[PDB]
Amino acid sequence: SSSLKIASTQEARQYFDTDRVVVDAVGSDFTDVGAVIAMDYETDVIDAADATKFGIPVFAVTKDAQAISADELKKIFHIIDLENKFDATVNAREIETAVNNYEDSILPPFFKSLKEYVSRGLIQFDCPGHQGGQYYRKHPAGREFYDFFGETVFRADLCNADVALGDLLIHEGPAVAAEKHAARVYNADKTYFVLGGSSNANNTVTSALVSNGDLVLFDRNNHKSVYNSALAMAGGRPVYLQTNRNPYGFIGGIYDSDFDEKKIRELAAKVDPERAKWKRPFRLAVIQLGTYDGTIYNAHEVVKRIGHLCDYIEFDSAWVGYEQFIPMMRNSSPLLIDDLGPEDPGIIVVQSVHKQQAGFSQTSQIHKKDSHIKGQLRYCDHKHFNNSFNLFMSTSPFYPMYAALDVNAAMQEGEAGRKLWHDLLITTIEARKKLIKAGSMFRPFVPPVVNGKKWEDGDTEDMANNIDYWRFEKGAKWHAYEGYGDNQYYVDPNKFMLTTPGINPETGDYEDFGVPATIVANYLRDHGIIPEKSDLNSILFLMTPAETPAKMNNLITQLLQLQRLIEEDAPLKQVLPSIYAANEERYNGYTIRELCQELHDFYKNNNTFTYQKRLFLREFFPEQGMLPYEARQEFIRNHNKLVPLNKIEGEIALEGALPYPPGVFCVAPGEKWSETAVKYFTILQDGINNFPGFAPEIQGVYFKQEGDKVVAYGEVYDAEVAKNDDRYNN
Amino acid sequence: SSSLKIASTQEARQYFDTDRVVVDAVGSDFTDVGAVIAMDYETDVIDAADATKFGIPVFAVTKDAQAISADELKKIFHIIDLENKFDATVNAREIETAVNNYEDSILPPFFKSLKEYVSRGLIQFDCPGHQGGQYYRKHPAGREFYDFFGETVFRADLCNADVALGDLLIHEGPAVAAEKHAARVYNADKTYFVLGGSSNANNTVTSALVSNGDLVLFDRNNHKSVYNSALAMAGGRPVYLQTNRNPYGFIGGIYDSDFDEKKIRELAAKVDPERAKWKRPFRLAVIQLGTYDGTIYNAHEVVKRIGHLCDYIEFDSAWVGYEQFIPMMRNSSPLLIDDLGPEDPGIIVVQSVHKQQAGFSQTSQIHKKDSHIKGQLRYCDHKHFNNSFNLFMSTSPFYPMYAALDVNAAMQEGEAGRKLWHDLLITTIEARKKLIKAGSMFRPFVPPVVNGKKWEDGDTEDMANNIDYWRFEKGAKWHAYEGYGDNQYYVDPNKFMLTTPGINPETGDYEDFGVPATIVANYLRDHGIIPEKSDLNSILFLMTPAETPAKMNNLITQLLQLQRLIEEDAPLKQVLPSIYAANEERYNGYTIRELCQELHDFYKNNNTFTYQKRLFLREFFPEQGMLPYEARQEFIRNHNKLVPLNKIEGEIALEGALPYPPGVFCVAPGEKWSETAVKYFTILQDGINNFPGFAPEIQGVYFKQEGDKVVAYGEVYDAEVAKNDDRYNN
């Protein structure tokens, strides 16, 4: 027991002697216990130690060992004979050796090395220049920071000259040791540890595979990181697949139909020989496994329906990663597709370990699963893939940030790991029942009825393993998703999503009254609860085993409290203190209902959710005036100008239009501004200039303050400036 | 005093009452003190409090205030009349208000906000998914990690849904607030906080300015990050400038001559019109301000000699940043070039804040100083420069890592900051004197004689402000640098460098006996001291105000101890325990002198340092067979094969050859393997296969295990594979 303590029951106490460490009772969560020591009859302690699925060695003290039943013997490690004092020293050695092996076995390779390295108190003259955080504590501000985070995070901040922790770049020693454990845990062929966010992780993927002018099959929901890297950077040629959207504006998956061999090819107008010739016209297809709004794909049906058309497939799964550890979710896992022939695509998975797994912000993994085509000329080897990695991977990775990727792997590994997640479904499934039965107006976006009974009337333990309760059925009265098919999509259970009053189910039109989600997000924040995101008529909360019932019931106290107030038409001053404070003029003497109604009508009258649909509907994509790689260059060269929003229609944008919702590009670079877009943006822009303290987050557009109102402006192609620029012509 | 304590003298104790906080004597370093309280006659305490240049408010308790001299009054903030009890409460209020303002004034904007945000205990449902590190503590390995780094580093790990700390991407609120303070502190026009290492910082710079086929003036010493981003990535065309090297193999600056307008242009053979036409044929010139081995440029003579030939200039100053804060070093600072006309180049500075400043690994800044040409078509605005920023900046920066860039700015700011650095010159200058006077065989790479007397016989305080003692004179008996000129280059004082026995000064040839620096690096590490790097006959130690005399004398204890043993020909077992252990066979019965001599002869007989020169000498650059952007594409497309080292001469490399020393590319991508290179690498390769436990670090080359020896192999162009690949031809 180096750091680990020892859990003993009061009776067992007097009978063991590894009194070198910290002993403590059992009502423990057993997470800092290296050995458990109890009396044989104290069977519930042996059971508690057991269920955790942790593997803590249990020692049962007896006075009649021959009497312990086989069954209990299947739960313990060693027996301690209380009536024998000659064994007192071997007893202590056994316990100590046990604790030490327990620990030596739970810690991942890199973390264990780093931890031991720091235990040496080496005199560092290498870089970081802060060396031990000792530069920091010499200055008063440096000292506040040093005492704020603590001496350790600095002590363990090391670099390349600390060879005992290996080489993280070309992967050697503990650095690669840990990456290989990640592989074993995730069922991949190589895991690359990325410390620059899945943003830079994608940059590695695309920049390794895609060559200039190569055909990229594009999921239209893709994060800016894919657009820019695969298309604008690598110079690939996208061939988009339209997306399902709905009255709530929710980001859905790809149109069931868009998955047609025949269609895709025609749809591959782009390079007729590339397409109308090849077995696989696409170098890569990049698809969003799980979207921000809870739609998870059946990785199994995609690889089958489009694998032959692409050399590799990148599943950008930043919003997931855990579906491989939740039984009912196995179909969604692409790394659990064990039967890949030489004919199907090398599969690749990019996941932000910080988002919904255990990791510090900026930590992600790249799982490489492509041995099935290891022969091929299309096959991208490690030398090539590590070349890319090294284009974006810093020459000086933050070490404590690497150990986080390492401890997350062991945390997902084993039944204990998969037990942690199950327990979360039980909590989550209960918080939702509580909200629903409690009468909340904010309702979990889940199937109303399932198996004749209603969703909240199911056995939670059944719902925690029964996918029937988490699936978007083909033809949904409730989800509104139009172009989906069977056993194609499911609802991500760790995306606690709630919808707000304002949108009608059956009818799919708006209602007369609606409670903009923003009013709710703000209320929450004002009461010490930070929501992840809140669109127009929905608010989202991100789940991981960190959740505890108290915390779930903490969110619900506030959700019921905000409702009590909206129905009682309280004063807008009271419900949203701060917004009223700042915008006291504009919101003078308002009631929440005043605002709710007002905001509500804006989008209602503005026919909002109609525009959000077309934006991702193929019969409404903008018009590619310039290829993405091209539009960039023009931008880089300064051949552009700032057309105002209103008269920018049909102008070629040199940057993507990134509004919220949904926060994906709406006009890719090189695409010429569409009538749709322009209008959606105008609803937003005017919404900004009408509801101060409620303005939607936009990107790729700039707001010039035009007297009373502010005004959007975008960087557009200027063929004239370009035209007359003698730097390029000849 | 929120966290800040209070330093009072025993006499002053009984006279003040802000007994709400922690009070403590004065023998303080004053770094956790918000107010200092003493008796008027205790003048040395008021002085100690003063010299720190911290700005701590001093309160002087008196019994005859009319008697305190003017001079002392210029040192105190407020007077405390001990003989007045009615003022007891206003006295306490004053002290408390004082401490609170002191603090509110020392903390940078972002740190202060993050710190206050965490003080609220908000219930986080946003991402990171670990939310508070509470996911981690639920698992035994997660718990070891959670207890290892502590609760705070996790608590303050936030994202976008935590709006109160602003928007770090598009820069708003506390995030931009801090970035602007960095600008004020650094004298730039915009500072961009980069959390992906100067590696990604460079990717931002080049990727914003350089357009495809643009002309890049290339410092041949440039880090892989520049080669790859400006050339291999942006597809720029380099025009190299040869580099000064020496018998120690040390990375020097650019050849004084290479800086000739006429030469540069001819030298610009590349695109005759681009050159033999334009005022500025170059879009960018990327130059290494300060190299790994101590040579710092005079930023003032560069901009003057080559500014007109380029639109912008990127000074990759990752090995520096502090020369702007050291008086004698101002010439080297580019941001302290205040007189920039519309005619001269927008100046940009990239610095790794973690390297030799105060920051966590992966932290760097990009200083944008280009307002002087803000009119121009060549002028790269923020919208364009933030576009690049956002290509590599993660959509989820690690926040604690951002506050590090923030506290580093305040730490450099003010006389207190510039006082911290000076003090370091005084320690460092004294450690070297000690080594030299003590008779060490490892000698600081400094001018032997200066001002008639010898270097270690100067007034240290004079040497800490006198550049004469840190400069490579034109024609040096001692530095061996050949192509340098006057007041062109200086020796970086915060790069504690020592050379080893083995190379002859006067003669510039090897000696008969030599002590490979690796022997020393290894000894050191074996005794709890981590050197930053150790080449063939030199070992480097990186300095910052974190150094303390005890630590300096700690290194020296070990340096004298290793010497005592080398002269006494100890057993190789004893001097290098571990190396002997592992390689017990090979080094059996060895004495250190046996190895020293052996290793020594290897490079001697191998004429090593001659090859290292030509490698950066223009009349010995490889032959560009393929432009860098091209060679990559071919690599990406798989048109390649693994030619072994020995028969790889004159083959086109698809990856740079990265040996150590010096750790810069020796064969850029597309360049065909040169005779020089091949040999240099063969010295290394054979050295690996001869001195196990002493193998040089290589990259871009692979070692296939050929029976007894291992073998280097590089990715070379394969025009045939290429030739027959029907995917590209038409």
Ligand SMILES: *Cc1c(COP(=O)(O)O)cnc(C)c1O
């Ligand atoms: C978060 C996100 C990214 C961007 O990566 P970071 O890890 O946040 O730096 C890329 N793809 C998807 C689907 C994402 O949600």
Ligand SMILES: *Cc1c(COP(=O)(O)O)cnc(C)c1O
């Ligand atoms: C360190 C270095 C880099 C690489 O940047 P990191 O900060 O280490 O990620 C780029 N340029 C130079 C001159 C460097 O020394």
